[PDB]
Amino acid sequence: PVTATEIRQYLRGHGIPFQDGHSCLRALSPFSFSLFIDKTTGHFLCMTSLAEGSWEDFQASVEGEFEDSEEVRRIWNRAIPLWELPDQEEVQLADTMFGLTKVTDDTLKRFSVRYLRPARSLVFPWFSPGGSGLRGLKLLEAKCVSYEETTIPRPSAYHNLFGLPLISRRDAEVVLTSRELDSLALNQSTGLPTLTLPRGTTCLPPALLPYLEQFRRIVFWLGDDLRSLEAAKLFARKLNPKRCFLVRPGDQQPRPLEALNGGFNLSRILRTALPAWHKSIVSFRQLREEVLGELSNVEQAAGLRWSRFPDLNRILKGHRKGELTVFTGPTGSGKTTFISEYALDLCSQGVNTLWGSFEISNVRLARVMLTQFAEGRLEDQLDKYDHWADRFEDLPLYFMTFHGQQSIRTVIDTMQHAVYVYDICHVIIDNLQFMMGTDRIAAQDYIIGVFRKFATDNNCHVTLVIHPGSAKASQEADNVLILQDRGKRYLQVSKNRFDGDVGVFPLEFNKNSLTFSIP
Amino acid sequence: PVTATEIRQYLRGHGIPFQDGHSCLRALSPFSFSLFIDKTTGHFLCMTSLAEGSWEDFQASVEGEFEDSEEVRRIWNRAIPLWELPDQEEVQLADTMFGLTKVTDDTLKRFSVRYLRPARSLVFPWFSPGGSGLRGLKLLEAKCVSYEETTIPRPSAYHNLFGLPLISRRDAEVVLTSRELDSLALNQSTGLPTLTLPRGTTCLPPALLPYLEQFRRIVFWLGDDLRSLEAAKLFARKLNPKRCFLVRPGDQQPRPLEALNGGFNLSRILRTALPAWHKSIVSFRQLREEVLGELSNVEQAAGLRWSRFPDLNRILKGHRKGELTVFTGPTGSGKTTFISEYALDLCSQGVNTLWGSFEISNVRLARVMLTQFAEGRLEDQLDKYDHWADRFEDLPLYFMTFQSIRTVIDTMQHAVYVYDICHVIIDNLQFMMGTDRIAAQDYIIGVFRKFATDNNCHVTLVIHPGSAKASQEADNVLILQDRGKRYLQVSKNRFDGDVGVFPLEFNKNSLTFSIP
């Protein structure tokens, strides 16, 4: 709830000379403008003093922290660099499974890529911004061809910009990659500075924003799918999209690793970058790739395909962005438990979901949601519980803990703050009546209309659940889901904005595993 | 009122240089900043002058007390320290029943733990904050394995922080314990400063808050139950939870006394102190223990089990925190008497209950409630009456003396801060008032729901003739209809959604409801 103007006047309160950058304001550090204050939420950070915290911490800082030390150096000391291996068969086996046939040893030295023998996995070291010791290691294992991502520490803490020490201060161009291997090839040929997101196309935390402030031109290259392009636009919204560019996916525009391996020229791909910012009126030149991509990726025209609801897959046909859906049904059928399976299944496929559960005691919801992840009954498997806890603490998931605040404004600003801080691409709220807190009809119309504004403006998908439907909601809403009863129920849809297809299928719910099923 | 800021301007009225601490403001004592004024209720106290009183007393103090002397020194002189006992069988018998198998004599000297022979009970001395003589003695007796707590003076006056003289001013960390024995083991191995609450997880009086002001990191460790964690959160609310931490209960996280005896590493447990303060959006890392605890303690997912209403237990399934219940029925059935039995049974199990009876002459209510404690007729037992007075004057219980909605609410919020009130019962809602009646009734019931959720304090309102608008706002309802045979019907269960009805046979001889 702190405006950018309020940030400037507080700096004027201390008379700090500040310059308005792209996103984070720059000023001389009181504790060459080393002090960085974010435009939103003001998480301060100094390029030299290296002090971080909240905006209120900065407010207390003018009146009058972490180490992150883990047994990671031991793993690094037990791994061998790939360019220093005299073996012949071992290295040839490695480059074939990791797709490093065209990778030369010179780039391996430049990026300090290391290889570990016990698991035959690559190592991508993380260095502190101050040039200190290692901060973490990211490991990739190839199994059959599939890449598995696992890093130390936990995924929620990995904030590494691969190549951050490598890039100099006299660089105005940078190309961001979804992976780490594709970044190596892109720097090999083009020679332009490159960086990698921490967890791929999932989330770009605001803490990394100050490091990318210097660059003037940013070219996004985050995969070869319509999902990658949509994620790029959401990421670009943080960094003043007037100073960024995009590389649309296509048949002739593969990933940087595949582009060099396939022999396709990559400097040509880097030359056709299109701006992500445009006026209110645009021509066909900035849409040629998208219409070409949509005409060759008819399945990608919709959202993700659920891995647990084949029947729901054939009617809704996907889970897009920006569209808002309202879900309702008779009470006592576990409609809250049903949407938990809907959110958890999509979350496992790389969707940052946010739970705004009200009147459900979210600590109780986590037990229900975690049982769904285990696909069974966790009471008997209490011995093997510390395992699933680690597996549950890597999906992008966040809950909203509202104790007394229930006002529509409060729940919205936190939601808008949630998008900026954790890249929230999905918000689910359990009870809408709890948010309240002809008057009830007018109030219900207002809040549903408010969520429609947030759904489209921020492109974040919203899936509201209604506790007793509303005629006025139908015009504003894009999709509706009705879960009637006849523990077997059926889900009926009567509004599909994207495809106009309706239908209904039965659901057989088993309380033993807390997972819906259908024979 | 206080409104925090009005304290500062009153200090600015005298121009006293003050620094805004965690909870209590600190300033130079006019009667190095020794003057402590609480953010709420302004109970002043000086670390050197040792003068205490109300905020109005402070106002009178700037314009122009107690001794607590009891025969406690005699009992102390009749007890022998445990580390100075040359006996072999007596000490071995003592440590086995008190669980002091792994306790070494070095820590016994440090905490000055003494033992008394006539009752075979431990002694935990209370020292004056100024380093003067003893202020009281707490005695724990083991019977079969069960620990009984009794101290001098009465429990309502015991305000001892065990180890307060021991902790130095150069200590930034402190871990609180619900008992006294578990504190000894925690300091034995970790070496970090430790303190104990006066009556365990029952209440932390504001008078003790100035002593804990200096510490910057506080790690709560108040037992091995979901009740302990909930009590810890309520206690943390008093002292800016941004500077405190919690240790959730679990199978691998026992009490410090059991943790050292069981061989589990305790410094490892002290490293997982998750913060009790968080933003508006949290991840699963700060909830792993809670879901693990709930999945292994399915009975603890609800509130305390009543020891006098087996039938009411099977339907409501517990007495949680923050939920509001409205109770009503036809008049003349003793609905006021029924709720007296409901709270008294829960109060004996360690719940601080506040009574807000209106238009019932609360002195008359105490007679009804005290008869329930004796479980019989007190008129015949008038000879053996002073005994029950001692037993009645140790449960956490407080009454309200008198009418606007704002007036009663501020006292209720004041009661939570001053006496750690976890339960408020009000008998007549109409007396609080002092389509208009329907609109007024909807407003007050909505206000109570705001207070119940915000302060997590359970509220059990009684309605004198029900209201449709109340059903949506309320969580639970209890209806006591008549057909002295009665029956209680529930038609709203927020936590479980289970309804039902069972008969009740009320006997006027003992003033206690029963069911064959």
Following DSSP, what letter does each residue of A12-40 receive, concatenated?
HHTT--EE--SSSEEE-------EEE-SS
For residue B206 the two structure tokens come to 């504001």
Omega before A153 within 30 of 0, i.e. cis: yes
Spacing of C-alpha B181 from chain mean position: 20
Beta bridge partners of A381: none
Is A21 within any annotated ligand binding site?
no
- Determine whether the interchain pair A366/B295 forms a contact, defined as Cβ–Cβ distance below 8 Å: no
CA distance A206 to chain B (A): 16
Q: Are strands B324-328 and B476-482 parallel, antiparallel or unpaired?
A: parallel
Q: How far is CA B128 from CA A403, B108, B161, B165, B181, in A?
A: 40, 20, 10, 9, 21
- Determine whether the interchain pair B280/A401 forms a contact, defined as Cβ–Cβ distance below 8 Å: yes
Beta bridge partners of A137: A125, A152
CA distance B57 to chain A (A): 32
- Determine whether the interchain pair A417/B292 forms a contact, defined as Cβ–Cβ distance below 8 Å: no
CA angle A80, A81, A85 (to 5 degrees): 80
- Determine whether the interchain pair A414/B285 forms a contact, defined as Cβ–Cβ distance below 8 Å: no
For residue B81 the two structure tokens come to 């320290």
* Radius of gyration (C-alpha) of chain B in whole angstroms: 25
- Determine whether the interchain pair A354/B281 forms a contact, defined as Cβ–Cβ distance below 8 Å: yes
Q: Compute the distance between CA of residue A446 and CA of residue A463 in angstroms, rounded to an integer.
A: 17
Residues in chain B closer than 8 A to A389 (CB atoms): 288, 292
For residue A420 the two structure tokens come to 């900026």
Beta bridge partners of A44: A53
Q: Compute the distance between CA of residue B116 and CA of residue B171 in angstroms, rounded to an integer.
A: 33
Q: Compute the distance between CA of residue A279 and CA of residue A282 in angstroms, rounded to an integer.
A: 7
Q: Between A379, A385, A401, which is nearest B282 by CB?
A: A401
- Determine whether the interchain pair B291/A401 forms a contact, defined as Cβ–Cβ distance below 8 Å: no
Report whether A301 contacts A294 (CB < 8 A): yes
What letter does residue A239 receive in the DSSP assignment? G
Closest CA to A433 of A389, A388, A466, A396: A466
Half-sphere exposure in the Cβ direction for B379 (13 Å, CA): 6
Report CA torsion sign: B335, B337, B342, B346. positive
Residues in chain B closer than 8 A to A367 (CB atoms): 291, 294-295
Q: Compute the distance between CA of residue A60 and CA of residue A90 in angstroms, rounded to an integer.
A: 56
Residues in chain B closer than 8 A to A363 (CB atoms): 287, 290-291, 294
- Determine whether the interchain pair B285/A156 forms a contact, defined as Cβ–Cβ distance below 8 Å: yes
- Determine whether the interchain pair B282/A367 forms a contact, defined as Cβ–Cβ distance below 8 Å: no
Q: Between A389, A400, A404, which is nearest B453 by CB?
A: A404
Q: Compute the distance between CA of residue A455 and CA of residue A462 in angstroms, rounded to an integer.
A: 6
User: Nearest residue on chain B to A402, judged by CA atoms?
Assistant: B280
Q: Compute the distance between CA of residue B174 and CA of residue B212 in angstroms, rounded to an integer.
A: 9
A47 phi, psi to nearest 5 deg: -65, -20
Q: Between A393, A405, A422, which is nearest B285 by CB?
A: A393
CB-count exposure of residue A233 (10 Å: 0-12, 13-18, 19+)? middle
The residue written with tokens 């309240």 in the block is A436
Q: Compute the distance between CA of residue A355 and CA of residue A237 in angstroms, rounded to an integer.
A: 23
Residues in chain B closer than 8 A to A401 (CB atoms): 278, 280-282
Is A109 within any annotated ligand binding site?
no
- Determine whether the interchain pair B280/A399 forms a contact, defined as Cβ–Cβ distance below 8 Å: no
Residues in chain B closer than 8 A to A404 (CB atoms): 450, 453-454
Is A333 within any annotated ligand binding site?
yes
Is A332 within any annotated ligand binding site?
yes
Interface residue of B246, B278, B279 to substitute, partner A, most A CBs within 10 Å:
B279
Half-sphere exposure in the Cβ direction for A139 (13 Å, CA): 18
Can you spell out the DSSP letters for B38-76?
A: -TTT--BEETTT---B-HHHHHHHT--------TTHHHH
End-to-end CA distance of chain B: 51
Is A336 within any annotated ligand binding site?
yes
- Determine whether the interchain pair B281/A389 forms a contact, defined as Cβ–Cβ distance below 8 Å: no
Kindly list the residues of chain B whose beta carbon comes within 8 Å of any beta carbon in chain A: 278, 280-285, 287-288, 290-292, 294-296, 298, 301, 450, 453-454, 497
Residue B11, Cβ neighbours under 10 Å: how many? 18
Quickly list H helices, A286-407: 288-296, 310-316, 335-347, 362-374, 386-392
Q: Compute the distance between CA of residue A268 and CA of residue B339 in angstroms, rounded to an integer.
A: 82
Closest CA to A278 of A266, A269, A290: A290
Give the orientation angle of helix A408-422 with respect to helix A439-457, to 10 degrees: 20
Which residues of B are known binding-site members?
Answer: 329-336
- Residue type at A401? T
Beta bridge partners of B185: none
User: Nearest residue on chain B to A377, judged by CA atoms?
Assistant: B295
- Residue type at A465? V
Q: Between A364, A379, A400, which is nearest B281 by CB?
A: A400
DSSP-derived 3-state class of residue A499: coil
Spacing of C-alpha A193 from chain mean position: 23
Residue B122 makes CB contacts below 8 A (sequence gap 6+) with B98, B113, B114, B115, B116, B139, B140, B180, B181
CA angle B393, B398, B400 (to 5 degrees): 140
Kindly list the residues of chain A whose beta carbon comes within 8 Å of any beta carbon in chain B: 154, 156, 332, 354, 363-364, 366-367, 370, 378-379, 382, 385, 389, 392-393, 397-405, 414, 417-418, 421-422
- Determine whether the interchain pair A414/B282 forms a contact, defined as Cβ–Cβ distance below 8 Å: no
CA distance B64 to chain A (A): 36
A479 phi, psi to nearest 5 deg: -130, 150
CA distance A279 to chain B (A): 35
Closest CA to B177 of B193, B156, B153, B191: B193
Closest CA to A207 of A424, A458, A423, A421: A421
Which residues of B are known binding-site members for ATP?
Answer: 329-336
CA distance A445 to chain B (A): 20
- Determine whether the interchain pair A393/B497 forms a contact, defined as Cβ–Cβ distance below 8 Å: no
B328 phi, psi to nearest 5 deg: -155, 160
- Determine whether the interchain pair B283/A332 forms a contact, defined as Cβ–Cβ distance below 8 Å: no
Closest CA to A185 of A113, A280, A80, A278: A113
Q: Compute the distance between CA of residue B348 and CA of residue B314 in angstroms, rounded to an integer.
A: 20
Residue A162, Cβ neighbours under 10 Å: how many? 24
The residue written with tokens 């380093």 in the block is B131
User: How many contacts (CB atoms, under 8 Å) link A and B?
Assistant: 63
Spacing of C-alpha B399 from chain mean position: 15
CA distance B495 to chain A (A): 9
Q: Compute the distance between CA of residue A212 and CA of residue A220 in angstroms, rounded to an integer.
A: 13
CA distance B285 to chain A (A): 7
b/e map of A470-481 (b: 16 or more CB within 10 Å)? beebeebbbbbb
- Determine whether the interchain pair B287/A398 forms a contact, defined as Cβ–Cβ distance below 8 Å: no
Quickly list H helices, B323-395: 335-347, 362-374, 386-392
Report whether A165 contacts A127 (CB < 8 A): yes
Report whether A327 contacts A481 (CB < 8 A): yes
Starting at the edge strand found earlier in the chain, the sheet holding A79-81 runs A79-81, A114-116, A121-127, A134-143, A146-152
Residues in chain B closer than 8 A to A63 (CB atoms): none
DSSP-derived 3-state class of residue A363: helix
For residue B462 the two structure tokens come to 């009684």
Spacing of C-alpha A159 from chain mean position: 13
Residues in chain B closer than 8 A to A418 (CB atoms): 281
Omega before B153 within 30 of 0, i.e. cis: yes
- Residue type at B395? L
Residues in chain A closer than 8 A to B294 (CB atoms): 363-364, 367
End-to-end CA distance of chain A: 50
